[PDB]
Design a protein around this ligand. Structure first.
Ligand code: ADP
Ligand code: BEF
Ligand code: MG
Lengths: 108, 83, 96, 95, 449, 95, 88, 109, 96
DNA sequence: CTGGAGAATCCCGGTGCCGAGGCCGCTCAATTGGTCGTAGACAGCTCTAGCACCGCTTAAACGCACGTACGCGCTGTCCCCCGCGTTTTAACCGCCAAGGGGATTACTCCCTAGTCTCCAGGCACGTGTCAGATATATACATCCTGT
DNA sequence: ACAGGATGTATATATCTGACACGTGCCTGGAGACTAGGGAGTAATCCCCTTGGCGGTTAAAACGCGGGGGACAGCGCGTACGTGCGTTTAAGCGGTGCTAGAGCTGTCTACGACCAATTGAGCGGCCTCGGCACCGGGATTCTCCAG
């Protein structure tokens, strides 16, 4: 037997291709599932993950703090139009409201 | 044993801080009675389903997952509680 | 005795380091990222399942996932994502 | 000294729109949740995080309703929220 | 009984044959070649059924709208003892005529269009009719058409078809006429199939046909000329871009966007006729220039042959087209030339149509060109005055064209009629003309009885 | 004779509410569906029933939006609907 | 010129003012401002764009050139606009 | 073998137990389906069918018609507080709008 | 033609005649009724499937369909639908 | 208009701490290889229903003008919140106990899927006929005007 | 205040038409009745996490009430609303022609699921020096008011 190479290494990905395949097979999505399907889905889940954490990291540095916390994630999603369209029906715990007053209410 | 009316335990100061996070500058006096009923109707809908799930599982304890599934049905996804 | 619980946390950590090398993350922000990955997995897999039933096929494939991604994601996110996934399948099929 | 009517209301908006704490007091809400549960089944016990999941969802719902309610009062050319503004917002939402 | 003039020997023989159908108790088809007087043969039959059989009962005639004023005129001329009435007009006029003229029952022939029948079907089914004459019977060739259904619900002692193109495209479209005449004989098209070298066997009992070449030796035969033409450079450009499907064209900016092409065949056909039919194609939004119009169409370059014709005696001409917009551009060309002309089309009101025909036919008339749309103007109307016919377009049905040519070649034509057909050489217009000729072969213009 | 302003407007409201017919013309709507589509993919053909599903869904959407617009107008104490009332209805519905 | 007698409007204009007024009358609107015709056209066009884009995604996936009634019904269902009567 | 009896006849139902079982088995809901699951589901679908047709038939009768049409169905669903909650997000074709004119809008007296 | 099309139409008509013997129904209305049965079926089977998964079970049983009915229907319909389902399963089991 | 006073967060530098990253061990799901059988790509054929044009008729929309319902800017009005301080109650924190019940593993044995075979419910089909449509007519509603 | 005009509306009766309604013939999913082997249920065990005990004592809620903000009614003013006229427009209907491309069946062979076997990524457990909560020092700088 030759030495093993995990399918994520073959596709050049950090998320797990093997686990995604099990989850699909046992999740009642279809009678069968192809071998390119877990590779495509693992690549999309890692891209969307990197898209959030990039803007979260920048919100953490803007607050001058080294660790991402749950508020930083809210400030990222809400301040981007497409992530706010993707996550428009979601509540995030320990997430504040973006700062905002209607200009009618401000003093003269 | 049996709990009396705790809906008066949602205080006038606490309803006012929720109106402030929502950007509200001035509040009429009758908002508080109106808000308590609105909260009670929302909680009754979420708890009813959360308990239907617990009963199906044959458990006496309501879990954080039972609440998360109840909210997910009503179009109110919540991140953070093991979802 | 105490059973194991699976999560995405070690992959989320490895992707953060690639994006922002010096930054860390709290355990509550990890619980939220683990919730996000599972929500998006379930959305894509539910649309990919139906599209196959509509067209009377029994197999989920990369083409049904590609259509599912175009239906679910907003316009620009969809474009970049589609490129990332087709890239990954191109690299994988060169090395299977 | 005395600040003027509505000046401290603006400081309160800014302060609560920066923080992520829960605003309703915890123990009182725990008694409210349990009282509601007796209408559906007797002698339920509860995980501590199941009550926090209910509180997070409940405060998120009320804050969002107060935003829709405020738009309606500005539409009617006023700055004070009224019971009819909550009723209009819920009706137009489909609740 | 017939007053104004004498029937010719073939009209006499046709009358005796129609009488023999009546006495044998059968219906039948009269299908002499166009221009041979089928209308008078019909008017004389009705005079007989009143003067000799004592039947003044109600009779009906169905016609195309453009011939309602001719039929009426001939009734008034040859046989004035028939009491003919005509239904046409707005809702109030139809209600007034039904109430004040039809239902009184003071008439013996009723003349109507196919639309007037489809509108007043519930009134006309009250009456019990003695004869039902349909003219241009090819109109009922498809049995599923609403006119064909409506027409089979009537109470009629006798039925009659008049048509000079009894065959159209297939044997089922002729069976559909036989099934109106004798539905209890030709019970089915699956029974007509197989019955069918069976030439004239089924037909002779119920059909009669004579040809001008046999029965009117004095009428000059037709001359037919194909003129093949090249495209203009602009037409060659559009014809290639249309095929590529990169027409583009958008008047509201958008970098010209794309024009949709779900049917390319019709776009290619348009182009051959003129480039200006397309949007944004005429050069210069101001427009009004006219030399440019003649040049950018290979057909129009040749059409200046109208100047030779006008100088060459009164070779007055008819121009036929299948597209309404083409009559527009030809009309702007004639107006810019200062020519004298007439135009008939499907948009025209009824009163106007007959005035135009009359003005063009007068003995001292000065109009050189008549423009006719091929559907509305190609049937029934008689225009013996003109010597020339131009077919700018070519139709998928050969028989439609034949009729149009015959608007001029008819009894009373003193001179040889020339027919010119335009064809763009290396285009889909070749395939259309080839297909139409493939359909002529199976018809063969059978002379018949 | 001349009916007063708004007398015929109530009479039309009653007629149209009783009927169940489509109110937009079919050819003018069919030509708009086709143009919008050409942007997404080119040279498409359409089933005759597919354009009717689009027209039923479109007229149902607009009628329902005009109800929310009229409650947002009456809240501001007016009887005339205006562009701002359409915009508040679409904002409270979250679209 | 006979050739230029006719002039064409944009296809949005086909939704006429008389056509919008009836829809508002079915919705119980008594009086209508003159700026609403422009606003309503903008709103319908955004609705048709979002439904059609998806109905075409389904058609492409099936490798067909014709949009069917089912392609429209599935697109409306996926957006919360369930329609009864056209099958499914 | 013994002569066949439909499972709907055994349950005392008009809807099809056999078709429902096949639909569930081939819809990819669970890797197994129980024997009582198709009978319980067919009972619920027939009950909900009867609830709509009873109200629709009353609406047809009040309108003096012998035939139920799409308008009668809308009137039934929208005047019932539970069916209008079950069906709050569906559009019924050729279904009208319940008649309602707001009070402010009406003539003065 | 050359292809059959299943529908609920005959079942809807057999129930119609028990509820109102005198009435009939149009083809447009019967097409809406077929759509109602299909929609409700897909709702109840989606909740049942999820319930099984959450509780880690391989089978959908009547106990999961009873709970799905209780999660989906409004209160007066839910209490009657549960009564009709339990009456049918008792009667079916007596003949089985 | 605007100087001044004086309560608001706001930086700054020290102090302690249990959160987060590291590693250990070792657990149990991914890997490879081989094999089986059937989903789905291909090509071919047929023939339904897509499109275009023109013709026909007349509902419909177009623009015009008329005149008055009601859009919306100012004013006066006088009630009900706001903000302050005070006193007051019940939240939080921490500490420590009993025992409900989540959870584990183990055992046993009822349940459903599989196969093949079989014959009756349900499919489309074609046809007579009656709810529905609508034509004309009128009788009773409701609205407007002017006096 | 309320009399006749006028208008639309309702419904009475008639005849009429075309979607429904029956039954026919036909054929393919439902139903019989056994074997298969796993899921499921129920016993019992362990010890996580829940339920109130007390006291302590901060902070939060509560009360009362001076005072000026906004809510709201009314008036008058003025310009797009609606109304109906005549007019022109093209929806709607029907009809012709044609062939794009949905649909079916047929054939053949790449693919995925499965098994057994294998060994490494990933799990939980036990660890600790460094992120950053917290306290108490001074900094402007928010806002407001009587000169
Ligand atoms: N016997 C006749 N004597 C004189 N003129 C005739 C005679 N028969 C026909 N015509 C004329 O010849 C013309 C062509 O006849 P027409 O009725 O149009 O035949 P069709 O309808 O078959 O073309 C008619 O205008 C008619 O006036
Ligand atoms: F046969 Be014809 F020219 F009416
Ligand atoms: Mg003639």
């Amino acid at each position: 037997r030759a030495k093993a190479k995990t399918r994520s290494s073959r596709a050049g990905l950090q998320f797990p291709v093997g686990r995604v395949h099990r989850l699909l097979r046992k999740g009642n999505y279809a009678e069968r599932v192809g071998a390119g399907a877990p590779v495509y889905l693992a690549a999309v889940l890692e891209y969307l993950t990197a898209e959030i954490l990039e803007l979260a990291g920048n919100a953490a540095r803007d607050n001058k703090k080294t660790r991402i916390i749950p508020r930083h994630l809210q400030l990222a999603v809400r301040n981007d139009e497409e992530l706010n369209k993707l996550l428009g029906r979601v509540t995030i715990a320990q997430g504040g409201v973006l700062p905002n007053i209607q200009s009618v209410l401000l003093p003269k | 044993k049996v709990l009396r009316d705790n809906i008066q335990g949602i205080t006038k100061p606490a309803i006012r801080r929720l109106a402030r996070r929502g950007g509200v500058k001035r509040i009429s006096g009758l908002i508080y009675e109106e808000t308590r009923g609105v909260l009670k109707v929302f909680l009754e809908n979420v708890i009813r389903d959360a308990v239907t799930y617990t009963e199906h599982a044959k458990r006496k304890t309501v879990t954080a997952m039972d609440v998360v599934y109840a909210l997910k049905r009503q179009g109110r996804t919540l991140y953070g509680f093991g979802g | 005795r105490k059973t194991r619980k699976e999560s995405y946390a070690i992959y989320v950590y490895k992707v953060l380091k690639q994006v922002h090398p010096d930054t860390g993350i709290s355990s509550k922000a990890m619980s939220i990222m683990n919730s996000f990955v599972n929500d998006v997995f379930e959305r894509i897999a539910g649309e990919a399942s139906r599209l196959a039933h509509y067209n009377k096929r029994s197999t989920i494939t990369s083409r049904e996932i590609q259509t599912a991604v175009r239906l679910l994601l907003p316009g620009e996110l969809a474009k970049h994502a589609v490129s990332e996934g087709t890239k990954a399948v191109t690299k994988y099929t060169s090395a299977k | 000294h005395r600040y003027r009517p509505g000046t401290v209301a603006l400081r309160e908006i800014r302060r609560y729109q920066k923080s992520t704490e829960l605003l309703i007091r915890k123990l009182p809400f725990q008694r409210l949740v349990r009282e509601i549960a007796q209408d559906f089944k007797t002698d339920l016990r509860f995980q501590s995080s199941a009550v926090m999941a209910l509180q997070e969802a409940s405060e998120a719902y009320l804050v969002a309703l107060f935003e829709d309610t405020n738009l309606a009062a500005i539409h009617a050319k006023r700055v004070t929220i009224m019971p009819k503004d909550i009723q209009l917002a819920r009706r137009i939402r489909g609740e | 009984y017939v007053k104004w003039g004498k029937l010719r020997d073939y009209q006499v023989r046709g009358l005796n044959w129609l009488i023999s159908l009546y006495e044998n108790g059968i219906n039948g088809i009269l299908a002499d070649e166009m221009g041979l007087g089928k209308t008078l043969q019909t008017i004389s039959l009705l005079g007989y059924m009143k003067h000799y059989r004592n039947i003044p009962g109600p009779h009906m005639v169905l016609v195309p709208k453009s011939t309602l004023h001719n039929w009426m005129s001939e009734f008034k001329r040859w046989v004035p003892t028939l009491r003919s009435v005509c239904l046409i007009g707005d809702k109030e006029q139809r209600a007034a005529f039904v109430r004040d003229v039809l239902l009184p029952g003071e008439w013996d022939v009723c003349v109507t269009s196919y639309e007037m029948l489809i509108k007043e079907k519930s009134v006309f089914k009250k009456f019990n009719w003695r004869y039902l004459v349909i003219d241009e019977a090819h109109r009922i060739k498809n049995e599923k058409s609403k006119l064909s259904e409506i027409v089979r619900e009537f109470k009629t002692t006798n039925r009659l078809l008049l048509t000079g193109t009894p065959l159209q495209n297939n044997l089922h479209e002729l069976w559909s006429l036989l099934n109106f005449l004798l539905p209890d004989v030709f019970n089915s098209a699956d029974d007509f199939d197989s019955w069918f070298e069976r030439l004239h066997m089924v037909l002779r009992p119920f059909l009669l046909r004579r040809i001008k070449a046999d029965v009117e030796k004095s009428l000059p035969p037709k001359k037919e000329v194909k003129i093949y033409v090249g495209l203009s450079k602009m037409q060659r450009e559009w014809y290639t871009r249309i095929l590529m499907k990169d027409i583009d064209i958008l008047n509201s900016a958008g970098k010209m966007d794309k024009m949709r092409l779900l049917n390319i065949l019709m776009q290619l056909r348009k182009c051959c006729n003129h480039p200006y039919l397309f949007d944004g194609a005429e050069p210069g939004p101001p427009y009004t220039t006219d030399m440019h119009l003649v040049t950018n169409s290979g057909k129009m370059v040749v059409l200046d042959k109208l100047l030779p014709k006008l100088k060459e005696q009164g070779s007055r001409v008819l121009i036929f087209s299948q597209m309404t917009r083409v009559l527009d551009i030809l009309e702007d060309y004639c107006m810019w030339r200062n020519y004298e002309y007439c135009r008939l089309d499907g948009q025209t009101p009824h009163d106007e149509r007959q005035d135009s025909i009359n003005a063009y036919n007068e003995p001292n008339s000065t109009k050189f060109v008549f423009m006719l749309s091929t559907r509305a103007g190609g049937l029934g109307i008689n225009l013996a005055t003109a010597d020339v016919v131009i077919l700018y377009d070519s139709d998928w049905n050969p028989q439609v064209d034949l009729q149009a040519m015959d608007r001029a070649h008819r009894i009373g034509q003193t001179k040889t009629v020339r027919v010119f057909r335009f064809i763009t050489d290396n285009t889909v217009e070749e395939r259309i003309v080839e297909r139409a000729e493939m359909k002529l072969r199976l018809d063969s213009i059978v002379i018949q009885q």
